[PDB]
Amino acid sequence: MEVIELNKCTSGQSFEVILKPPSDPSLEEIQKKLEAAEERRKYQEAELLKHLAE
Amino acid sequence: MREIVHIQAGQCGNQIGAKFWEVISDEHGIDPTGSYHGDSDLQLERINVYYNEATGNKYVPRAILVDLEPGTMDSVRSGPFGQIFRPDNFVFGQSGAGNNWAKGHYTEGAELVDSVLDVVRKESESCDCLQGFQLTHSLGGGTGSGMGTLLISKIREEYPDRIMNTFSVMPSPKVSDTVVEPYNATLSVHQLVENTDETYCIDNEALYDICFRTLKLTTPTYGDLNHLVSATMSGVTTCLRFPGQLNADLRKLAVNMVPFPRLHFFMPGFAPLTSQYRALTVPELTQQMFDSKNMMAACDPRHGRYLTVAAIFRGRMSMKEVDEQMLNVQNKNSSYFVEWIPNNVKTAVCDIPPRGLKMSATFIGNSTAIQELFKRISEQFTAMFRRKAFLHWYTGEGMDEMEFTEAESNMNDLVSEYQQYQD
Amino acid sequence: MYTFVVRDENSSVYAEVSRLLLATGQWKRLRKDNPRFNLMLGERNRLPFGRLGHEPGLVQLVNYYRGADKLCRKASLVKLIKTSPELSESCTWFPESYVIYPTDEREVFLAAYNRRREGREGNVWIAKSSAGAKGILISSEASELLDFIDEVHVIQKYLEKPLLLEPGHRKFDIRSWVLVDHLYNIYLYREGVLRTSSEPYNSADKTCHLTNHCIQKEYSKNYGRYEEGNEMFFEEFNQYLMDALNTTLENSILLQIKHIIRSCLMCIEPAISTKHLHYQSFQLFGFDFMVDEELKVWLIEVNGAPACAQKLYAELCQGIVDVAISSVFPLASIFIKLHHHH
Amino acid sequence: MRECISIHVGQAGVQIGNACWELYCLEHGIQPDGQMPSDKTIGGGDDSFNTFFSETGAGKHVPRAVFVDLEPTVIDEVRTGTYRQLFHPEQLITGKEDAANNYARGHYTIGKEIIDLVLDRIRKLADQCTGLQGFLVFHSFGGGTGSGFTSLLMERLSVDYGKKSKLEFSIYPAPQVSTAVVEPYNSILTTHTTLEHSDCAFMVDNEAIYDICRRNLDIERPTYTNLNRLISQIVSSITASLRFDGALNVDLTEFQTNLVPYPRIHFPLATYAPVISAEKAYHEQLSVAEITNACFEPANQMVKCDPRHGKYMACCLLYRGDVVPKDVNAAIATIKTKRSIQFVDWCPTGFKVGINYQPPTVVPGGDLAKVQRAVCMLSNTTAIAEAWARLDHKFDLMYAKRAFVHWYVGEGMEEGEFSEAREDMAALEKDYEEVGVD
């Protein structure tokens, strides 16, 4: 084993032990998605109200 | 504050609706005058779901009473809790509906429906955040069936984003008033298929058999039948009325219980059903709750498969033992639960038991076996419709035979849709 | 009422186990995709171990050890023996083997091959792999072996001096069935089988060199001459060792067999044990051994999904239910327990 | 000093956040009224605890936290709780009606109408930061708000705070305490949308916490209160390096550098020991070797899986209490000769170790006993993909029948998002198998 990067302070310490060496969408694009879903909800509600009007 | 607006329509709807308000007022500590006299803050934590608070800390049911004749509603106003209802919420005509879906839906009911919607609007306008509506009615008569489904269609038009829930009493020749009940029920079922999110199927055939075979009542009355309905309605609404994690509102219940929009017809069950001081253990509660003899729809669950199940236990008991027994029933009879909906059985526990019982359990099942109920109605419909028998009562109100043919095809489609997911 | 699922229809051993469980009246068979089971008779390939032990209120048990493939593959067994200090390359009961890819030990095999040919000693090797169903070449030329693989294989020293049964002057191999339960107890079935060659051993034809039951039934003219189905059981073999070599099966062979079984399974115990795991495993193994003319036992093969001898299906499968299944799910010895320190 | 902002979304995120900030105050000596007598710099300062707490002129230490829920009842508990004085109303955001366990309702329908308010309240906290380093986001997988609104919030945070790191504490669904049949849908929908926006996510399976509470705390039927007190202990040990003096995991960027070499594979497994019942009058205190050996037992992991049948990419040991490096290295040497610990070939076989001398703080009157030393291991092992396989299988069972899909389409979500999210999870499972299996 090899201990490296030992750092000590009043509240504790840290180190590393080695055992073996190795071998986004824009604001506009998000807004389009939210508005597209809202438009689909509006279309579904309009079809329902049309069905109820018949 | 997720308020529910309650509506009861017709003779059956007002009689079971009044008993429902009598039972849950007692559970929440509300006296016939609207004054709270309980001793637990759990009684009032979710009191606003069903009750408005008036002057003097009075609690007024958010309930609207509808009928096309004043008879039954006069009896309600003279009943035990008759004075608790808001007097302006009594909306009634004088002509009656003559056990005729057409009179309720198209002629007599159309003249009265606007005044009901005015009262519904007044109650909704005072809600902090209305979650939806619950309707109690029968399907075999004229007002509850015909005007009740008319009301549902108009409420959906005005409140399209709110949940619609019904307690719908299905007719049976064993407990029948008129021969046209299959006509009225078939016409109403198609309305429910389209315009409700959740419907508890309360079969008068099942209610009669339970009173006679189990409760040992040789001559059951409607009052005896309505005692089973009150207990069931109290149990299935427990999760809406008391603090809890599961199915705490009408929409989360629908999301848990309805995998396909049209298949939203539930088989309710209750335990215990005693013909009375003996203690009922958790294994006994769980086994009786799943027994077909405790179901309210007169359908054999072993003839179908459970899509979803909600179970509610009431009383002081071991939640560890409740979990073990609920897992036992599922693991014992796993063939009766569809495998393509994992963990489809949900369990709630409420510490407050119903009146007169230390422990109780309520069952809500979305089973494909409910198709037996619709098949039964469809057969009785066709037996008369093939000879156009008794149709003149309906064509005299402006209806055409084609509307009956379409209602017939619509319910046969519903039956075929249940059979699809049973295989 | 316990529940189980069947996911390997081709398993003759667990088709009998499933038949026995149903005959108890206390076990119910579910659909193969129903997750609410107590016992899974799993498939051989890509058993979904990651979906086991996540069912509330169900103690779940599976008939395979995840990770046991390290022992039950040709190339995996060679690497496991060489790289594990518990077994080491100085392992005396395993033939000198090398993993040759068509990690690679081409130069190491040729180094020992050149050392043998230079030393005028026996230099016969055998090439095989896990893809050989009824693909094996035995040769004394390393060039012929390396050219065959290119057309993952292993090449191990062919035991040129096997113990030959008389009459017949014929080769054999010993199959041992071993059951490891959920507590990692190692149970050796008291009944083994000698799968014998019916042809005389010729050190100058693969029918007299390969003792497989399929090869003897498809290429040997003497199939079933000396023993039925070219299968000699322990009672006759022990009687032969007494009459011919003045010794017993227990002393001359079985002590080494029990030592090898224990060594292999103890080596992989930390990697496969289900002691503190959310599900439990058991597994039936088929160990194959060779015996040389000096009564030394050599390990050749470990089978992870073995079949059984026809005469021994009923006894062994019943023993599986007794110590592996009913020990976890009790209802309402034919094994030798190889004791060890966990 | 660089500030960190905590965001708690939905019921699970809020209730876990309430348990964490209660524990933080106990650890830092902050009273329920916000006062901190040990803090000698009144009204300001850039100490390590100031990464999580701001200071008013009156000496109140205010959490850098936002609570968001689409239903008011859970956050109203924070408004009238023990630590109600820590927070001002601007930090507590409530809606009128929740997402009804529906990812699409939380993400599209309700999320569109409240996302700008939430970001404005977060902006108010960021404006108090001299050097904000990023966010810690607490939420469930299964709830409509925890799944649907979190993914929308995480997308917008990448837009408005492009350089900032974002870490997750995510509650993986378990039927023993779950409240919705569609939770596998919501889990996969939110993982797909959040995957490119999260730098490091600590998944906690409610099943593992439930059984640890039953087995090690002798709780017959654990409640959310039992679960969240244990979860807050694990969260505290994970964030302690941001709140105390030290040299390991001292900023959010170091979490990715130390635990996440492959960006998509950013779900470290947490293992915690020891969990000891406070009901036991006297318990034998476990040594460094014993608690370190317990980090390799599946019974102590936040997700039940088998690290023996995977490969490690990184491993951190976070100790609290009476621990010195000599005993850690002696424990590691013994463990390596008994345990199946395989690292991928392109990574060194080793452990980054951090020790904080202050032993763990337990909530007075809680279920957890005070111990002399404890450890939380954070290991990026491919074995955690077993949790994805379980989740994806349940998804496949329901989606093959389109069960419950109409609830999501009714909220404006396209059905193609289901298969798109599932294809992403399929590619994720394939990544883990390519890394951890030969």
Ligand SMILES: Nc1nc2c(ncn2[C@@H]2O[C@H](COP(=O)(O)OP(=O)(O)OP(=O)(O)O)[C@@H](O)[C@H]2O)c(=O)[nH]1
């Ligand atoms: N560990 C833990 N899990 C919780 C807690 N609360 C809820 N959960 C889990 O979270 C999932 C449900 O999500 P919730 O957070 O309750 O739902 P939500 O985020 O409020 O979203 P909606 O209510 O649908 O609007 C289930 O799997 C619960 O088991 C909690 O306090 N602690």
Ligand SMILES: Nc1ncnc2c1ncn2[C@@H]1O[C@H](COP(=O)(O)OP(=O)(O)CP(=O)(O)O)[C@@H](O)[C@H]1O
């Ligand atoms: N190193 C060796 N020395 C001598 N003979 C050997 C040998 N390796 C194999 N044999 C012979 O060749 C036969 C086939 O070997 P192998 O172990 O490949 O069988 P197999 O895997 O094809 C079927 P099984 O799974 O039942 O063992 C053995 O039964 C044995 O008789």
Ligand SMILES: Nc1nc2c(ncn2[C@@H]2O[C@H](COP(=O)(O)OP(=O)(O)O)[C@@H](O)[C@H]2O)c(=O)[nH]1
């Ligand atoms: N369970 C129950 N069923 C009833 C009651 N009253 C009527 N019914 C049933 O309801 C149907 C008659 O409809 P009814 O409500 O009386 O007609 P309406 O007033 O026009 O709605 C028949 O199937 C009856 O069996 C009652 O009090 N309880």
Ligand SMILES: [Ca+2]
């Ligand atoms: Ca008129």
Ligand SMILES: [Ca+2]
């Ligand atoms: Ca200060």
Ligand SMILES: [Ca+2]
């Ligand atoms: Ca980013």
Ligand SMILES: [Mg+2]
């Ligand atoms: Mg009547």
Ligand SMILES: [Mg+2]
């Ligand atoms: Mg083989």
Ligand SMILES: [Mg+2]
């Ligand atoms: Mg919520």
